RNA sequence: GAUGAGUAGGAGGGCGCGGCGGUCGCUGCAAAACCUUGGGCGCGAGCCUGGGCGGAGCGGCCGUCGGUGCAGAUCUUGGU
RNA sequence: CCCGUCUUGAAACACGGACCAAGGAGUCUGACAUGUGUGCGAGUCAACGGGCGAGUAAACCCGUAAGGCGUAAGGAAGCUG
RNA sequence: ACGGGCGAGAGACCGAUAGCGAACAAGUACCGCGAGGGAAAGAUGAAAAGGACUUUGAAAAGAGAGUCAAAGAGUGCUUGAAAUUGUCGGGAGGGAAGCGGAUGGGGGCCGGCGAUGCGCCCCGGUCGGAUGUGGAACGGUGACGAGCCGGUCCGCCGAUCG
């Protein structure tokens, strides 16, 4: 939006807001990120900690298809049950509602938060943490590895 | 105002078909109203024609000193064509007045613009006499 | 609303193509109204016009003249009648074209192919 | 629910309207929302 | 040559979020229903029979545009209709000679 | 028509406030502009040189933008814009917009005498 | 103006506030942030002037 | 002369109005203007302060958050200039009363099928004119992405400011200036 | 009630130009443009208007957009 | 005291400017960031594409376990969470 | 995929110093040994009806006259700003002029520039006159029911006022 652009405002002011004595000039610190070493060394230092140098190994023809790994909390895992399911695992305590987190996309299982009272529940997937099935041997339910 | 007028005043506030506005947005804007409804012409909340459910309507008639005294029908705010209560007052000033109060005021229709409507009647009856007989004054007397 | 793809709206194009029209185009585009007793009896709205036809021109200054046309000048697309004319300073006398939209024909001069087309603009409105 | 009347025509035999106010006819109207949809989708042309 | 030249990569158009158009077109159908929002926004409907204006089925097979003429004149749209025709005007400025007459 | 305002109209100042240097140079034209120059003794506003406008001279907000005649102006471009002022004859003149021909001008003067609505250019194109 | 069909399909194309509309997956109706806008009848009303 | 500070005049500068153009939004703030000059209530005047503010001032609170400051108070009704979210990790949903400027669908759904009621500020005003009876709460303003970034540079010691990276990885500013190994660290 | 300086610089509210979506108008009983010791409004950017000339178009308002505002640049072209 | 400019300091024996008209210089695009307006909200984004449709470059509709960002972080990594 | 070739449709683009260099006999006139460089230049009128004829002049032309709605449109012909120049009229001027503020002399302009109405009585002329009685359509409130209340218009008996 051209009209609200402060250069209209600037319009008969001379200098269009650059100063009279520094002025606006075509590359008075050198181009991108010149001098990062040099003459910008503070700004990089104190708003870009380790920029400069190489840490690690390298790893060539990488693909993040084989490193591939969502994980669902415990604290969501209810949220998955249908509301029908739900209602059936209230009403009924002879029975746990079974969860394949693998079907909606979730490999392996953390121990996050805490799950509905008093109600068991059988969880199946890829890999757990220690913590989740502590939670869930307590709750009263089961876990069942898969892939 | 099939919605409350307070809604339909915060949309056509800000602009209307019948809103008259000259010499810019600075300290000379003068704003006036159109519609047919608004016994001042003025563009505000209290005169709008258009957010308001209870309005009154007085202009003259096309002859014989008739003066088109109508009042906007409080339940039937979604049929334009029978809108309007429409009377036709043929007699003299003073019953003409008389009805005018008693349908703005007396009913507790519209009290607040009693004597806006009083004075339109006023201008409007002077504008009919001076169209039958032509200007026989200056009216710069003080 | 125009609809055939084939056929622009663009103003340009169009004044284009009327100014750049040859001489066959510019006498279909130089058409005039058939009289009310003509249409009637042809079933026949307009035609172009011709040499030898009679024309009663219906608007301008000559809104009551009639005559027999004497020229069709394509090129300035103007027409000129038997005895509308004017005087120069000179005092000689010159034609003045009067467009042809603007006259109406009173009698047409009949042959084989003006015949064959007011059959077949006649066919058509049936 | 409010009740709205169906005009009938001259050739048309049955005078039956009655149709339900829909509720899209009592969603809010905001001028604000209007005007910069209205603005933005009108450069798509 | 001018300065910044124009170029055809200009951001010419928009990307408005579904949600927002059909709250826009939600709050224009509502609004049409007001009466005294339709005429403030120039619309002659002191003849309509009732807002919202709904007309029978019957509409819909109408072949003839004096048909069409009658129908409007029937439900009281008709004076909208002739306000359109009687507006029609050559566009004022450069627009004029640019296939907007 | 008696005008409503009572408070008679002070001026702060009724000169025109002229661009420096405008009766120098042909090319710099009177409308004013505020100097941005470093040096400038207008915009140091050195004594004996142009002075330049500031809010100060603002006038009294009741009589503001009010006419020698006590009203106010408004612009009618026909008959039917003069009826908004029927109720504000003592507050608003009305002035005839300088395209309105002499036929609508007849007009718009006979409606606001019947009115009686004073118009300022009420004998232009007669 | 509308026929008669068009008004009647409004309410399966564009839903309500309670139920969804089948012609918009997962569409609802937005609500205002004011139940009542009738501003009258709030500022005079008993409790208020109370 | 007088030796005052800009002539006496303030430097502050406060919202006075909301930058909305909501016109629901304006009757409300109509009402409460109305509401603060007629009766002098504190609730009336803090409904009315928050009603200018922009979006990032009046952040949303969840529902098991809202859920948790009403333990215990469940009769009064809670009000909340902002929105109010839906959450998933909230299995137990009681009957309360809540005022807010906008409900999600879930958490509206929610909230009427626990036997509560969503309430505009309109009918918080027709229930409780002076506050009387009343939760007022704030959604957590600084939980934001934004604000991670404000604070101390995250170059200088004891920071723990997030810095600007384009991406997260060991080849993403982690070498000089982060490890003893490299340089200095922080 | 108090108060009023401002280069560099920041911001707000306004003035002006040309399009687009709408709306309200003007114009051969004379539009635009231009001319004028005619008059007036605004602190100001500017605006309204009398008279003349011109002889075919133009404007107000709400949004929205832009190749949108000149005294300078040994600035460009043309003219003197 | 002659304007504009650089300057601690210009009426300067400092530079540009004989005069007038028209043209004449912070723009467009990509990546981010704060702020504000709007929609939705643990979600959000149909415009890669498809179905259509003002007989139509618009508008409308469509996300299957699609994809982007967000919803979990710490390690060079194995890995844990 | 497609700034070339042939053929089409469009535009929130430019509008003759703009837009391609080129809206025109433009890659032309012209320049360079050459490779190359490269302009300026659109608008009478609806229609030529393009100014007969007289007179002065060597002639260009002038003065009359004629055409046209118009020559205040006369072929580099819609309109015709500024710089700059001539003429007439007013005014000022001992080595600048111009300019800010205050009056004055002279000029120019302005009649919304600056009113003649109002109240109370008498005479004359027109137009209407209840809380009564019927009709037509209608409204406020209530619950777009009942009940209550109410105005406009029309016809009548009284009233004899405005
Ligand atoms: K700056
Ligand atoms: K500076
Ligand atoms: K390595
Ligand atoms: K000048
Ligand atoms: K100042
Ligand atoms: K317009
Ligand atoms: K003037
Ligand atoms: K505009
Ligand atoms: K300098
Ligand atoms: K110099
Ligand atoms: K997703
Ligand atoms: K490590
Ligand atoms: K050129
Ligand atoms: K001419
Ligand atoms: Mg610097
Ligand atoms: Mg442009
Ligand atoms: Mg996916
Ligand atoms: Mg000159």
């Known amino acids: ?147 | 105002t099939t919605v409350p007028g307070q809604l339909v005043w915060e949309i056509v506030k800000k602009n209307n078909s019948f809103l008259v506005k000259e010499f810019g947005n600075g300290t000379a804007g003068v704003v006036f109203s159109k519609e047919p409804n608004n016994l001042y012409n003025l563009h505000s909340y209290k005169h709008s024609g258009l957010a308001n459910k209870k309005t009154v309507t007085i202009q003259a008639e096309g002859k014989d000193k008739s003066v088109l005294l109508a009042t906007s029908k409080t339940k039937k705010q979604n049929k334009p064509s029978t809108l309007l209560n429409k009377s036709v007052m043929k007699k003299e000033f003073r019953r003409m007045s008389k009805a005018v109060t008693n349908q703005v005021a007396d009913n507790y229709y519209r009290p607040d613009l009693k004597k806006a409507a009083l004075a339109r009647l006023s201008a409007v009856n002077r504008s009919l006499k001076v169209a039958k007989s032509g200007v026989k004054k200056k009216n710069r007397q003080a | 609303m125009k609809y055939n793809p084939r056929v622009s709206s663009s103003r340009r194009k169009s004044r284009k193509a009327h100014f750049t029209a040859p001489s066959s185009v510019r006498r279909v585009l130089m058409s005039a109204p058939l009289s009310s007793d003509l249409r009637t009896k042809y079933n026949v709205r307009s035609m172009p016009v011709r040499k030898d036809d009679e024309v009663q021109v219906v608007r301008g200054t000559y809104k009551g003249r009639e005559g027999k046309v004497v020229q069709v000048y394509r090129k300035k697309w103007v027409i000129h009648i038997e005895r509308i004319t004017r005087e120069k300073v000179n005092g000689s006398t010159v034609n003045v074209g009067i467009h042809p939209s603007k006259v109406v024909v009173t009698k047409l001069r009949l042959d084989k192919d003006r015949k064959s087309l007011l059959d077949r603009k006649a066919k058509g409105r049936a | 629910i409010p009740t709205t009347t169906v005009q009938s025509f001259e050739n048309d035999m049955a005078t039956d309207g009655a149709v339900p106010l829909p509720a899209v006819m009592k969603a809010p109207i905001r001028p604000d929302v209007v005007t910069y949809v209205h603005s933005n989708i009108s450069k798509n042309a | 040559r001018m300065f910044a030249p124009t170029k055809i990569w200009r951001r010419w158009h928009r990307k408005i979020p579904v949600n927002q158009k059909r709250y826009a077109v939600a709050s224009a159908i509502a609004a049409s229903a007001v009466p005294s929002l339709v005429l403030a926004r120039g619309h002659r409907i002191e003849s309509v029979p009732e807002l919202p204006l709904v007309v029978s089925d019957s509409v819909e097979s109408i072949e003839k545009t004096s048909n069409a003429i009658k129908a409007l004149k029937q439900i009281g749209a008709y004076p909208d209709a002739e306000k359109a025709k009687d507006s029609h005007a050559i566009r004022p400025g450069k627009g004029k000679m640019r296939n907007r007459r | 028509a008696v005008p409503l305002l009572t408070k008679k109209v002070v001026k702060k100042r009724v000169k025109r406030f002229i661009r420096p240097q405008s009766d120098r140079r042909i090319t710099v034209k009177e409308s004013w502009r505020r100097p941005k120059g470093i040096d400038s003794r207008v915009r140091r506003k050195f004594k004996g040189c142009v002075l330049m406008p500031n809010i100060g001279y603002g006038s009294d907000k009741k009589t503001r933008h009010y006419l020698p005649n006590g009203f106010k102006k408004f612009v009618v471009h026909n008959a039917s814009e003069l009826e908004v002022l029927m109720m504000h004859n003592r507050t608003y003149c009305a002035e005839i917009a300088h395209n309105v021909s002499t036929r609508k001008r007849k007009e718009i003067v006979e409606r606001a005498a019947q009115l009686d609505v004073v118009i300022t250019n009420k004998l232009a194109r007669l | 103006v509308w026929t008669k069909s068009a008004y009647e399909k409004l309410d399966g194309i564009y839903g309500s506030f309670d139920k969804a509309s089948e012609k918009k997956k997962g569409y609802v109706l937005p609500r205002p942030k004011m139940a009542n806008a009738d501003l009258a009848r709030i500022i005079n009303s008993d409790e208020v002037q109370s | 002369g007088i030796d005052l500070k800009a002539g006496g005049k303030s430097k502050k500068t406060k919202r006075t109005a909301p930058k909305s153009d909501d016109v629901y939004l304006k009757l409300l703030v109509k009402l409460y203007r109305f509401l603060v000059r007629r009766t002098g209530s504190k609730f009336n005047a803090v409904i009315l302060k928050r009603l200018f503010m922009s979006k990032i001032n009046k952040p949303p609170l969840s529902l098991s958050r809202l859920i948790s400051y009403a333990k215990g108070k469940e009769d009064k009704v809670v009000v909340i200039v902002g929105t109010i979210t839906d959450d998933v990790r909230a299995y137990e949903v009681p009957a309360l009363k809540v005022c807010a400027l906008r409900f999600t669908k879930t958490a509206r759904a929610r909230i009427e099928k626990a036997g509560g009621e969503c309430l505009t500020f309109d009918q918080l005003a027709l229930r409780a004119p002076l506050g009387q009876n009343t939760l007022l709460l704030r959604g957590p303003k600084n939980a934001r992405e934004a604000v991670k970034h404000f604070g101390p540079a995250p170059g200088v010691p004891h920071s723990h400011t997030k810095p600007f990276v384009r991406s997260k990885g060991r080849k993403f500013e982690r070498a000089r200036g982060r490890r003893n190994s490299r340089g200095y660290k922080a």
């Open chain 1, 1 to 147: 939006t051209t009209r609200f652009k402060k250069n209209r405002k600037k319009r008969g002011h001379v200098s269009a807001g650059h100063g009279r004595v520094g002025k606006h000039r075509k590359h008075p610190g050198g181009r991108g990120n010149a001098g990062g070493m040099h003459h910008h060394r503070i700004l990089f230092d104190k708003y870009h900690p380790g920029y400069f140098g190489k840490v690690g190994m390298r790893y060539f023809h990488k693909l993040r298809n084989k490193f591939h790994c969502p994980t669902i909390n415990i604290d969501n895992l209810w949220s998955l049950v249908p509301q029908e399911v739900k209602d059936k695992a209230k009403s009924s305590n002879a029975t746990a509602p079974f969860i394949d987190v693998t079907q909606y996309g979730y490999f392996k299982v953390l121990g996050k938060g805490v799950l509905p009272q008093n109600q068991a529940v059988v969880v199946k997937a890829k890999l757990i943490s220690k913590n989740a099935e502590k939670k869930i041997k307590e709750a009263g339910g089961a876990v069942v590895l898969t892939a």
